[PDB]
mmCIF file of all heavy atoms in Angstrom:
data_model
loop_
_atom_site.group_PDB
_atom_site.id
_atom_site.type_symbol
_atom_site.label_atom_id
_atom_site.label_comp_id
_atom_site.label_asym_id
_atom_site.label_seq_id
_atom_site.Cartn_x
_atom_site.Cartn_y
_atom_site.Cartn_z
ATOM 1 N N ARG A 1096 21.847 -46.400 -84.642
ATOM 2 C CA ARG A 1096 21.953 -45.052 -84.848
ATOM 3 C C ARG A 1096 20.964 -44.192 -84.050
ATOM 4 O O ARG A 1096 21.326 -43.205 -83.469
ATOM 5 C CB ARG A 1096 21.673 -44.776 -86.367
ATOM 6 C CG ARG A 1096 21.752 -43.312 -86.790
ATOM 7 C CD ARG A 1096 23.206 -42.783 -86.724
ATOM 8 N NE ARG A 1096 23.552 -42.296 -85.377
ATOM 9 C CZ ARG A 1096 24.707 -41.872 -85.011
ATOM 10 N NH1 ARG A 1096 25.783 -41.876 -85.774
ATOM 11 N NH2 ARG A 1096 24.905 -41.501 -83.752
ATOM 12 N N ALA A 1097 19.725 -44.668 -83.962
ATOM 13 C CA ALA A 1097 18.635 -43.918 -83.252
ATOM 14 C C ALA A 1097 18.874 -43.977 -81.732
ATOM 15 O O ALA A 1097 18.733 -43.031 -80.979
ATOM 16 C CB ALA A 1097 17.279 -44.563 -83.518
ATOM 17 N N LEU A 1098 19.433 -45.134 -81.254
ATOM 18 C CA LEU A 1098 19.501 -45.307 -79.751
ATOM 19 C C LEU A 1098 20.874 -44.700 -79.258
ATOM 20 O O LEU A 1098 20.935 -44.783 -78.025
ATOM 21 C CB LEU A 1098 19.549 -46.814 -79.497
ATOM 22 C CG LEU A 1098 18.133 -47.452 -79.181
ATOM 23 C CD1 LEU A 1098 18.170 -48.902 -79.304
ATOM 24 C CD2 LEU A 1098 17.712 -46.960 -77.698
ATOM 25 N N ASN A 1099 21.668 -44.211 -80.072
ATOM 26 C CA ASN A 1099 22.941 -43.506 -79.595
ATOM 27 C C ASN A 1099 23.866 -44.528 -78.977
ATOM 28 O O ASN A 1099 24.541 -44.316 -77.947
ATOM 29 C CB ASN A 1099 22.643 -42.462 -78.614
ATOM 30 C CG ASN A 1099 23.895 -41.598 -78.352
ATOM 31 O OD1 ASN A 1099 25.020 -41.766 -78.914
ATOM 32 N ND2 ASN A 1099 23.770 -40.589 -77.487
ATOM 33 N N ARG A 1100 23.907 -45.766 -79.540
ATOM 34 C CA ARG A 1100 24.845 -46.833 -79.064
ATOM 35 C C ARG A 1100 25.548 -47.466 -80.275
ATOM 36 O O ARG A 1100 24.932 -47.488 -81.376
ATOM 37 C CB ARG A 1100 24.078 -47.931 -78.194
ATOM 38 C CG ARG A 1100 22.847 -48.421 -78.953
ATOM 39 C CD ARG A 1100 21.902 -49.073 -77.941
ATOM 40 N NE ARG A 1100 22.528 -49.928 -76.870
ATOM 41 C CZ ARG A 1100 22.061 -50.170 -75.734
ATOM 42 N NH1 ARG A 1100 20.966 -49.484 -75.198
ATOM 43 N NH2 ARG A 1100 22.671 -51.038 -74.954
ATOM 44 N N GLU A 1101 26.777 -47.962 -80.072
ATOM 45 C CA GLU A 1101 27.493 -48.527 -81.183
ATOM 46 C C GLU A 1101 26.893 -49.783 -81.711
ATOM 47 O O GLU A 1101 26.124 -50.516 -80.998
ATOM 48 C CB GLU A 1101 28.884 -48.796 -80.769
ATOM 49 C CG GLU A 1101 29.738 -47.518 -80.369
ATOM 50 C CD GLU A 1101 29.412 -46.900 -79.049
ATOM 51 O OE1 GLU A 1101 28.640 -47.579 -78.267
ATOM 52 O OE2 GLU A 1101 29.940 -45.921 -78.685
ATOM 53 N N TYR A 1102 27.108 -50.030 -82.977
ATOM 54 C CA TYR A 1102 26.531 -51.265 -83.638
ATOM 55 C C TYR A 1102 27.622 -52.263 -83.910
ATOM 56 O O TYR A 1102 28.845 -52.014 -83.986
ATOM 57 C CB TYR A 1102 26.064 -50.814 -85.012
ATOM 58 C CG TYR A 1102 25.690 -51.999 -85.911
ATOM 59 C CD1 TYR A 1102 24.316 -52.402 -85.906
ATOM 60 C CD2 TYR A 1102 26.570 -52.525 -86.752
ATOM 61 C CE1 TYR A 1102 23.970 -53.458 -86.734
ATOM 62 C CE2 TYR A 1102 26.228 -53.641 -87.584
ATOM 63 C CZ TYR A 1102 24.894 -54.029 -87.613
ATOM 64 O OH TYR A 1102 24.560 -55.110 -88.392
ATOM 65 N N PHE A 1103 27.171 -53.601 -83.891
ATOM 66 C CA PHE A 1103 28.058 -54.727 -84.232
ATOM 67 C C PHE A 1103 27.196 -55.826 -84.544
ATOM 68 O O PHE A 1103 26.170 -56.040 -84.008
ATOM 69 C CB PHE A 1103 28.996 -55.078 -83.019
ATOM 70 C CG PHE A 1103 29.558 -56.472 -83.148
ATOM 71 C CD1 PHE A 1103 30.718 -56.615 -83.801
ATOM 72 C CD2 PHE A 1103 28.966 -57.523 -82.500
ATOM 73 C CE1 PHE A 1103 31.318 -57.906 -83.980
ATOM 74 C CE2 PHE A 1103 29.523 -58.769 -82.662
ATOM 75 C CZ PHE A 1103 30.693 -58.937 -83.325
ATOM 76 N N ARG A 1104 27.683 -56.689 -85.522
ATOM 77 C CA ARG A 1104 26.985 -57.866 -85.948
ATOM 78 C C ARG A 1104 27.925 -59.046 -85.829
ATOM 79 O O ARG A 1104 29.133 -58.908 -85.838
ATOM 80 C CB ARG A 1104 26.576 -57.763 -87.405
ATOM 81 C CG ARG A 1104 27.652 -57.666 -88.462
ATOM 82 C CD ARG A 1104 27.187 -58.332 -89.788
ATOM 83 N NE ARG A 1104 27.179 -59.797 -89.668
ATOM 84 C CZ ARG A 1104 26.406 -60.536 -90.315
ATOM 85 N NH1 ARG A 1104 25.500 -60.094 -91.172
ATOM 86 N NH2 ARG A 1104 26.469 -61.931 -90.117
ATOM 87 N N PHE A 1105 27.368 -60.236 -85.548
ATOM 88 C CA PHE A 1105 28.024 -61.540 -85.336
ATOM 89 C C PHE A 1105 27.404 -62.602 -86.273
ATOM 90 O O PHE A 1105 26.138 -62.535 -86.475
ATOM 91 C CB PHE A 1105 27.892 -61.825 -83.872
ATOM 92 C CG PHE A 1105 28.496 -63.153 -83.442
ATOM 93 C CD1 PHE A 1105 29.767 -63.188 -82.801
ATOM 94 C CD2 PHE A 1105 28.057 -64.408 -83.796
ATOM 95 C CE1 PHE A 1105 30.455 -64.366 -82.480
ATOM 96 C CE2 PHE A 1105 28.684 -65.541 -83.503
ATOM 97 C CZ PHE A 1105 29.889 -65.536 -82.848
ATOM 98 N N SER A 1106 28.247 -63.458 -86.736
ATOM 99 C CA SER A 1106 27.842 -64.466 -87.598
ATOM 100 C C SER A 1106 27.850 -65.786 -86.818
ATOM 101 O O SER A 1106 28.952 -66.188 -86.356
ATOM 102 C CB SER A 1106 28.651 -64.594 -88.872
ATOM 103 O OG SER A 1106 28.325 -65.757 -89.593
ATOM 104 N N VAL A 1107 26.707 -66.494 -86.669
ATOM 105 C CA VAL A 1107 26.601 -67.689 -85.828
ATOM 106 C C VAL A 1107 26.074 -68.758 -86.768
ATOM 107 O O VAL A 1107 25.497 -69.745 -86.289
ATOM 108 C CB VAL A 1107 25.919 -67.518 -84.623
ATOM 109 C CG1 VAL A 1107 24.380 -67.402 -84.877
ATOM 110 C CG2 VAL A 1107 26.132 -68.595 -83.553
ATOM 111 N N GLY A 1108 26.273 -68.661 -88.067
ATOM 112 C CA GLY A 1108 25.672 -69.694 -89.094
ATOM 113 C C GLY A 1108 26.471 -70.852 -89.119
ATOM 114 O O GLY A 1108 27.637 -70.815 -89.602
ATOM 115 N N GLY A 1109 25.899 -72.026 -88.741
ATOM 116 C CA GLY A 1109 26.526 -73.280 -88.888
ATOM 117 C C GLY A 1109 27.763 -73.496 -88.052
ATOM 118 O O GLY A 1109 28.429 -74.406 -88.180
ATOM 119 N N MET A 1110 27.964 -72.508 -87.125
ATOM 120 C CA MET A 1110 29.136 -72.538 -86.250
ATOM 121 C C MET A 1110 28.983 -73.805 -85.292
ATOM 122 O O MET A 1110 27.831 -74.042 -84.879
ATOM 123 C CB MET A 1110 29.321 -71.252 -85.420
ATOM 124 C CG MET A 1110 28.457 -70.982 -84.260
ATOM 125 S SD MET A 1110 28.828 -72.053 -82.760
ATOM 126 C CE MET A 1110 30.240 -71.001 -82.128
ATOM 127 N N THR A 1111 30.049 -74.388 -84.886
ATOM 128 C CA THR A 1111 30.055 -75.502 -84.001
ATOM 129 C C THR A 1111 30.972 -75.267 -82.714
ATOM 130 O O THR A 1111 30.632 -75.860 -81.696
ATOM 131 C CB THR A 1111 30.525 -76.823 -84.698
ATOM 132 O OG1 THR A 1111 29.488 -77.256 -85.646
ATOM 133 C CG2 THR A 1111 30.661 -77.997 -83.737
ATOM 134 N N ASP A 1112 32.163 -74.648 -82.900
ATOM 135 C CA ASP A 1112 32.973 -74.518 -81.850
ATOM 136 C C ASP A 1112 32.669 -73.202 -81.005
ATOM 137 O O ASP A 1112 32.808 -72.120 -81.595
ATOM 138 C CB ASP A 1112 34.421 -74.439 -82.372
ATOM 139 C CG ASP A 1112 35.472 -74.685 -81.185
ATOM 140 O OD1 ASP A 1112 35.228 -74.225 -80.029
ATOM 141 O OD2 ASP A 1112 36.537 -75.362 -81.488
ATOM 142 N N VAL A 1113 32.108 -73.257 -79.750
ATOM 143 C CA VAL A 1113 31.879 -72.147 -78.928
ATOM 144 C C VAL A 1113 33.152 -71.245 -78.663
ATOM 145 O O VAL A 1113 33.056 -70.174 -78.241
ATOM 146 C CB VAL A 1113 31.288 -72.631 -77.556
ATOM 147 C CG1 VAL A 1113 32.325 -73.464 -76.835
ATOM 148 C CG2 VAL A 1113 30.826 -71.465 -76.826
ATOM 149 N N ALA A 1114 34.268 -71.779 -79.125
ATOM 150 C CA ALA A 1114 35.482 -71.011 -78.866
ATOM 151 C C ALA A 1114 35.429 -69.630 -79.487
ATOM 152 O O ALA A 1114 35.928 -68.654 -78.902
ATOM 153 C CB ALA A 1114 36.697 -71.692 -79.397
ATOM 154 N N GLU A 1115 34.728 -69.453 -80.582
ATOM 155 C CA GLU A 1115 34.627 -68.134 -81.190
ATOM 156 C C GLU A 1115 33.953 -67.063 -80.210
ATOM 157 O O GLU A 1115 34.232 -65.854 -80.439
ATOM 158 C CB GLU A 1115 33.895 -68.164 -82.524
ATOM 159 C CG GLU A 1115 32.387 -68.266 -82.455
ATOM 160 C CD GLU A 1115 31.783 -68.103 -83.757
ATOM 161 O OE1 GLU A 1115 31.761 -67.098 -84.476
ATOM 162 O OE2 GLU A 1115 31.112 -69.177 -84.207
ATOM 163 N N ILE A 1116 33.229 -67.526 -79.329
ATOM 164 C CA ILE A 1116 32.689 -66.671 -78.237
ATOM 165 C C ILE A 1116 33.498 -66.866 -76.976
ATOM 166 O O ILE A 1116 33.849 -65.949 -76.258
ATOM 167 C CB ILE A 1116 31.265 -66.960 -77.966
ATOM 168 C CG1 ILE A 1116 30.394 -66.676 -79.202
ATOM 169 C CG2 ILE A 1116 30.758 -66.094 -76.807
ATOM 170 C CD1 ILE A 1116 30.090 -67.949 -79.939
ATOM 171 N N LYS A 1117 34.074 -68.070 -76.681
ATOM 172 C CA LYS A 1117 34.819 -68.418 -75.512
ATOM 173 C C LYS A 1117 36.200 -68.331 -75.706
ATOM 174 O O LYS A 1117 37.028 -68.537 -74.754
ATOM 175 C CB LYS A 1117 34.436 -69.807 -75.084
ATOM 176 C CG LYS A 1117 33.104 -69.957 -74.394
ATOM 177 C CD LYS A 1117 33.172 -69.316 -73.101
ATOM 178 C CE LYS A 1117 31.929 -69.745 -72.150
ATOM 179 N NZ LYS A 1117 31.884 -69.252 -70.828
ATOM 180 N N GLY A 1118 36.720 -67.917 -76.890
ATOM 181 C CA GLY A 1118 38.085 -67.798 -77.185
ATOM 182 C C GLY A 1118 38.895 -69.186 -76.808
ATOM 183 O O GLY A 1118 38.356 -70.164 -77.196
ATOM 184 N N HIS A 1119 39.872 -68.986 -76.132
ATOM 185 C CA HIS A 1119 40.657 -70.156 -75.658
ATOM 186 C C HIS A 1119 41.296 -69.843 -74.301
ATOM 187 O O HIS A 1119 41.426 -68.753 -73.917
ATOM 188 C CB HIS A 1119 41.733 -70.675 -76.687
ATOM 189 C CG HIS A 1119 41.019 -71.229 -77.942
ATOM 190 N ND1 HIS A 1119 40.497 -72.386 -78.034
ATOM 191 C CD2 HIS A 1119 40.983 -70.664 -79.178
ATOM 192 C CE1 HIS A 1119 40.010 -72.671 -79.169
ATOM 193 N NE2 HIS A 1119 40.286 -71.487 -79.937
ATOM 194 N N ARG A 1120 41.864 -70.927 -73.676
ATOM 195 C CA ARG A 1120 42.446 -70.793 -72.392
ATOM 196 C C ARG A 1120 43.690 -69.952 -72.194
ATOM 197 O O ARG A 1120 44.253 -69.959 -71.097
ATOM 198 C CB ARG A 1120 42.696 -72.225 -71.838
ATOM 199 C CG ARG A 1120 43.562 -72.997 -72.639
ATOM 200 C CD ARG A 1120 43.982 -74.340 -71.972
ATOM 201 N NE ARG A 1120 45.170 -74.949 -72.666
ATOM 202 C CZ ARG A 1120 45.217 -75.408 -73.903
ATOM 203 N NH1 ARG A 1120 44.142 -75.384 -74.690
ATOM 204 N NH2 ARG A 1120 46.370 -75.905 -74.326
ATOM 205 N N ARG A 1121 44.150 -69.285 -73.350
ATOM 206 C CA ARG A 1121 45.142 -68.243 -73.245
ATOM 207 C C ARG A 1121 46.481 -68.727 -72.795
ATOM 208 O O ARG A 1121 47.345 -67.971 -72.638
ATOM 209 C CB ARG A 1121 44.692 -67.036 -72.439
ATOM 210 C CG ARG A 1121 44.763 -67.174 -70.985
ATOM 211 C CD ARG A 1121 44.647 -65.863 -70.288
ATOM 212 N NE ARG A 1121 44.563 -65.996 -68.818
ATOM 213 C CZ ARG A 1121 45.535 -65.989 -68.047
ATOM 214 N NH1 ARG A 1121 46.772 -65.697 -68.514
ATOM 215 N NH2 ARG A 1121 45.440 -66.088 -66.769
ATOM 216 N N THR A 1122 46.588 -70.086 -72.442
ATOM 217 C CA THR A 1122 47.931 -70.602 -72.235
ATOM 218 C C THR A 1122 48.582 -71.281 -73.429
ATOM 219 O O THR A 1122 49.744 -71.428 -73.466
ATOM 220 C CB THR A 1122 47.850 -71.728 -71.048
ATOM 221 O OG1 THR A 1122 49.149 -71.988 -70.602
ATOM 222 C CG2 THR A 1122 47.120 -72.877 -71.462
ATOM 223 N N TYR A 1123 47.743 -71.708 -74.396
ATOM 224 C CA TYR A 1123 48.191 -72.192 -75.659
ATOM 225 C C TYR A 1123 48.635 -71.109 -76.481
ATOM 226 O O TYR A 1123 47.978 -70.036 -76.557
ATOM 227 C CB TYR A 1123 47.172 -73.118 -76.323
ATOM 228 C CG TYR A 1123 47.662 -73.585 -77.660
ATOM 229 C CD1 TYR A 1123 48.521 -74.661 -77.763
ATOM 230 C CD2 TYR A 1123 47.154 -73.059 -78.905
ATOM 231 C CE1 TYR A 1123 49.061 -75.071 -78.906
ATOM 232 C CE2 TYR A 1123 47.633 -73.558 -80.003
ATOM 233 C CZ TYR A 1123 48.595 -74.544 -80.144
ATOM 234 O OH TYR A 1123 48.995 -74.988 -81.256
ATOM 235 N N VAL A 1124 49.705 -71.250 -77.232
ATOM 236 C CA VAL A 1124 50.226 -70.196 -78.132
ATOM 237 C C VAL A 1124 49.233 -69.752 -79.197
ATOM 238 O O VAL A 1124 48.533 -70.662 -79.771
ATOM 239 C CB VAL A 1124 51.648 -70.579 -78.725
ATOM 240 C CG1 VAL A 1124 52.086 -69.527 -79.621
ATOM 241 C CG2 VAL A 1124 52.671 -70.816 -77.653
ATOM 242 N N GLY A 1125 49.038 -68.504 -79.439
ATOM 243 C CA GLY A 1125 48.138 -68.029 -80.472
ATOM 244 C C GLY A 1125 46.716 -67.870 -80.095
ATOM 245 O O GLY A 1125 45.920 -67.627 -80.944
ATOM 246 N N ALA A 1126 46.465 -68.137 -78.737
ATOM 247 C CA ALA A 1126 44.974 -67.991 -78.277
ATOM 248 C C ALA A 1126 44.517 -66.577 -78.594
ATOM 249 O O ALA A 1126 45.173 -65.643 -78.346
ATOM 250 C CB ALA A 1126 44.862 -68.340 -76.870
ATOM 251 N N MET A 1127 43.181 -66.447 -78.980
ATOM 252 C CA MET A 1127 42.531 -65.254 -79.277
ATOM 253 C C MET A 1127 41.223 -65.172 -78.499
ATOM 254 O O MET A 1127 40.545 -66.226 -78.410
ATOM 255 C CB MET A 1127 42.314 -64.997 -80.717
ATOM 256 C CG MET A 1127 41.785 -63.704 -81.102
ATOM 257 S SD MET A 1127 43.086 -62.443 -81.163
ATOM 258 C CE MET A 1127 43.424 -62.399 -82.933
ATOM 259 N N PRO A 1128 40.831 -64.046 -77.895
ATOM 260 C CA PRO A 1128 39.538 -64.001 -77.249
ATOM 261 C C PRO A 1128 38.386 -64.044 -78.277
ATOM 262 O O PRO A 1128 38.536 -63.917 -79.494
ATOM 263 C CB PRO A 1128 39.536 -62.655 -76.619
ATOM 264 C CG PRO A 1128 40.550 -61.821 -77.372
ATOM 265 C CD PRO A 1128 41.643 -62.847 -77.720
ATOM 266 N N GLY A 1129 37.135 -64.309 -77.743
ATOM 267 C CA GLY A 1129 35.988 -64.413 -78.567
ATOM 268 C C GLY A 1129 35.629 -63.175 -79.267
ATOM 269 O O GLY A 1129 36.080 -62.096 -78.933
ATOM 270 N N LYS A 1130 34.724 -63.256 -80.308
ATOM 271 C CA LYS A 1130 34.411 -62.152 -81.090
ATOM 272 C C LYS A 1130 33.664 -61.081 -80.248
ATOM 273 O O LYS A 1130 33.676 -59.933 -80.569
ATOM 274 C CB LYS A 1130 33.465 -62.602 -82.180
ATOM 275 C CG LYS A 1130 33.435 -61.571 -83.454
ATOM 276 C CD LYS A 1130 32.694 -62.187 -84.527
ATOM 277 C CE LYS A 1130 33.297 -63.544 -85.128
ATOM 278 N NZ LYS A 1130 34.706 -63.485 -85.219
ATOM 279 N N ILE A 1131 32.999 -61.507 -79.060
ATOM 280 C CA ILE A 1131 32.324 -60.531 -78.276
ATOM 281 C C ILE A 1131 33.408 -59.514 -77.665
ATOM 282 O O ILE A 1131 33.140 -58.305 -77.487
ATOM 283 C CB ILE A 1131 31.624 -61.211 -77.205
ATOM 284 C CG1 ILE A 1131 32.409 -62.037 -76.265
ATOM 285 C CG2 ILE A 1131 30.493 -61.991 -77.779
ATOM 286 C CD1 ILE A 1131 31.752 -62.538 -74.965
ATOM 287 N N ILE A 1132 34.656 -60.144 -77.331
ATOM 288 C CA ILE A 1132 35.702 -59.224 -76.771
ATOM 289 C C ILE A 1132 36.151 -58.248 -77.882
ATOM 290 O O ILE A 1132 36.404 -57.029 -77.548
ATOM 291 C CB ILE A 1132 36.890 -60.132 -76.241
ATOM 292 C CG1 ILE A 1132 36.395 -61.221 -75.263
ATOM 293 C CG2 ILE A 1132 37.896 -59.252 -75.675
ATOM 294 C CD1 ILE A 1132 35.762 -60.541 -74.009
ATOM 295 N N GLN A 1133 36.256 -58.699 -79.074
ATOM 296 C CA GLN A 1133 36.666 -57.733 -80.159
ATOM 297 C C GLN A 1133 35.574 -56.683 -80.405
ATOM 298 O O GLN A 1133 35.868 -55.551 -80.569
ATOM 299 C CB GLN A 1133 36.926 -58.563 -81.465
ATOM 300 C CG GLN A 1133 37.584 -57.778 -82.594
ATOM 301 C CD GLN A 1133 36.495 -57.074 -83.431
ATOM 302 O OE1 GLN A 1133 35.279 -57.366 -83.458
ATOM 303 N NE2 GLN A 1133 36.978 -56.155 -84.320
ATOM 304 N N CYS A 1134 34.343 -57.125 -80.344
ATOM 305 C CA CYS A 1134 33.266 -56.090 -80.482
ATOM 306 C C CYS A 1134 33.330 -55.042 -79.337
ATOM 307 O O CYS A 1134 33.197 -53.920 -79.625
ATOM 308 C CB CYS A 1134 31.915 -56.866 -80.359
ATOM 309 S SG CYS A 1134 30.470 -55.752 -80.115
ATOM 310 N N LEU A 1135 33.501 -55.509 -78.099
ATOM 311 C CA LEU A 1135 33.590 -54.538 -77.042
ATOM 312 C C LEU A 1135 34.920 -53.578 -77.227
ATOM 313 O O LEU A 1135 34.849 -52.472 -77.047
ATOM 314 C CB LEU A 1135 33.805 -55.224 -75.627
ATOM 315 C CG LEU A 1135 32.494 -56.028 -75.288
ATOM 316 C CD1 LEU A 1135 32.837 -56.912 -74.048
ATOM 317 C CD2 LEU A 1135 31.396 -55.066 -74.990
ATOM 318 N N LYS A 1136 35.994 -54.188 -77.624
ATOM 319 C CA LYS A 1136 37.282 -53.439 -77.824
ATOM 320 C C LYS A 1136 37.036 -52.277 -78.902
ATOM 321 O O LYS A 1136 37.392 -51.256 -78.771
ATOM 322 C CB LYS A 1136 38.378 -54.440 -78.262
ATOM 323 C CG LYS A 1136 39.668 -53.702 -78.461
ATOM 324 C CD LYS A 1136 40.746 -54.814 -78.664
ATOM 325 C CE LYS A 1136 42.122 -54.266 -78.906
ATOM 326 N NZ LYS A 1136 43.197 -55.225 -79.367
ATOM 327 N N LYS A 1137 36.501 -52.742 -80.066
ATOM 328 C CA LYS A 1137 36.281 -51.703 -81.125
ATOM 329 C C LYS A 1137 35.182 -50.728 -80.827
ATOM 330 O O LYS A 1137 35.307 -49.471 -80.959
ATOM 331 C CB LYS A 1137 36.026 -52.330 -82.361
ATOM 332 C CG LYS A 1137 34.703 -53.064 -82.555
ATOM 333 C CD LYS A 1137 34.461 -53.638 -83.979
ATOM 334 C CE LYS A 1137 33.190 -54.376 -84.043
ATOM 335 N NZ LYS A 1137 32.024 -53.394 -84.033
ATOM 336 N N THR A 1138 34.065 -51.246 -80.290
ATOM 337 C CA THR A 1138 32.947 -50.357 -79.981
ATOM 338 C C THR A 1138 33.262 -49.297 -78.968
ATOM 339 O O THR A 1138 32.519 -48.275 -78.866
ATOM 340 C CB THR A 1138 31.731 -51.197 -79.563
ATOM 341 O OG1 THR A 1138 32.173 -52.095 -78.552
ATOM 342 C CG2 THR A 1138 31.152 -51.972 -80.674
ATOM 343 N N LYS A 1139 34.269 -49.536 -78.081
ATOM 344 C CA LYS A 1139 34.643 -48.694 -77.032
ATOM 345 C C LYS A 1139 33.499 -48.331 -76.005
ATOM 346 O O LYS A 1139 33.505 -47.270 -75.415
ATOM 347 C CB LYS A 1139 35.100 -47.301 -77.736
ATOM 348 C CG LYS A 1139 35.884 -46.340 -76.731
ATOM 349 C CD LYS A 1139 37.064 -46.967 -76.029
ATOM 350 C CE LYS A 1139 38.247 -47.197 -77.072
ATOM 351 N NZ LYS A 1139 38.714 -45.966 -77.659
ATOM 352 N N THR A 1140 32.592 -49.271 -75.853
ATOM 353 C CA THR A 1140 31.585 -49.085 -74.935
ATOM 354 C C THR A 1140 31.053 -50.472 -74.382
ATOM 355 O O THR A 1140 31.234 -51.489 -75.055
ATOM 356 C CB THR A 1140 30.277 -48.418 -75.634
ATOM 357 O OG1 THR A 1140 29.817 -49.143 -76.744
ATOM 358 C CG2 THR A 1140 30.666 -46.990 -76.158
ATOM 359 N N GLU A 1141 30.454 -50.429 -73.233
ATOM 360 C CA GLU A 1141 29.905 -51.560 -72.580
ATOM 361 C C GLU A 1141 28.365 -51.757 -72.879
ATOM 362 O O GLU A 1141 27.785 -52.653 -72.456
ATOM 363 C CB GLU A 1141 30.107 -51.558 -71.093
ATOM 364 C CG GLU A 1141 31.488 -51.691 -70.663
ATOM 365 C CD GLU A 1141 31.718 -51.635 -69.187
ATOM 366 O OE1 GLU A 1141 30.816 -51.239 -68.473
ATOM 367 O OE2 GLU A 1141 32.776 -52.142 -68.640
ATOM 368 N N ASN A 1142 27.802 -50.801 -73.588
ATOM 369 C CA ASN A 1142 26.354 -50.848 -74.030
ATOM 370 C C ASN A 1142 26.308 -50.539 -75.535
ATOM 371 O O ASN A 1142 25.579 -49.688 -75.935
ATOM 372 C CB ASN A 1142 25.573 -49.851 -73.194
ATOM 373 C CG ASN A 1142 26.053 -48.388 -73.301
ATOM 374 O OD1 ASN A 1142 27.195 -48.166 -73.756
ATOM 375 N ND2 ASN A 1142 25.197 -47.477 -72.911
ATOM 376 N N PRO A 1143 26.984 -51.377 -76.383
ATOM 377 C CA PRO A 1143 26.654 -51.247 -77.810
ATOM 378 C C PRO A 1143 25.497 -52.078 -78.142
ATOM 379 O O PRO A 1143 24.730 -52.637 -77.353
ATOM 380 C CB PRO A 1143 27.990 -51.818 -78.361
ATOM 381 C CG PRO A 1143 28.441 -52.751 -77.388
ATOM 382 C CD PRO A 1143 28.105 -52.227 -76.119
ATOM 383 N N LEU A 1144 25.221 -52.153 -79.489
ATOM 384 C CA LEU A 1144 24.048 -52.917 -80.084
ATOM 385 C C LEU A 1144 24.711 -54.132 -80.756
ATOM 386 O O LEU A 1144 25.216 -54.106 -81.816
ATOM 387 C CB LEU A 1144 23.302 -52.125 -81.057
ATOM 388 C CG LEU A 1144 21.780 -52.642 -81.298
ATOM 389 C CD1 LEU A 1144 21.052 -51.545 -81.972
ATOM 390 C CD2 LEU A 1144 21.826 -53.938 -82.036
ATOM 391 N N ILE A 1145 24.488 -55.381 -80.040
ATOM 392 C CA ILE A 1145 25.063 -56.571 -80.539
ATOM 393 C C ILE A 1145 23.942 -57.403 -81.305
ATOM 394 O O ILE A 1145 22.866 -57.475 -80.730
ATOM 395 C CB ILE A 1145 25.639 -57.409 -79.447
ATOM 396 C CG1 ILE A 1145 26.813 -56.684 -78.683
ATOM 397 C CG2 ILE A 1145 26.007 -58.877 -79.859
ATOM 398 C CD1 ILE A 1145 27.240 -57.275 -77.398
#
Side-chain angles (χ1 to χ4, degrees):
Chain A
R1096 178 70 275 172
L1098 268 162
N1099 193 2
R1100 51 208 306 155
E1101 292 78 7
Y1102 171 94
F1103 163 87
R1104 68 148 284 151
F1105 180 105
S1106 171
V1107 73
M1110 81 75 78
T1111 291
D1112 197 322
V1113 63
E1115 82 174 288
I1116 300 98
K1117 285 289 194 175
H1119 294 285
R1120 56 175 199 293
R1121 78 166 174 93
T1122 190
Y1123 179 74
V1124 176
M1127 186 79 98
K1130 204 173 301 313
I1131 61 170
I1132 305 301
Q1133 191 270 346
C1134 164
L1135 296 168
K1136 184 178 179 180
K1137 71 176 178 68
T1138 48
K1139 190 57 68 64
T1140 59
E1141 293 180 342
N1142 56 344
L1144 202 168
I1145 297 169

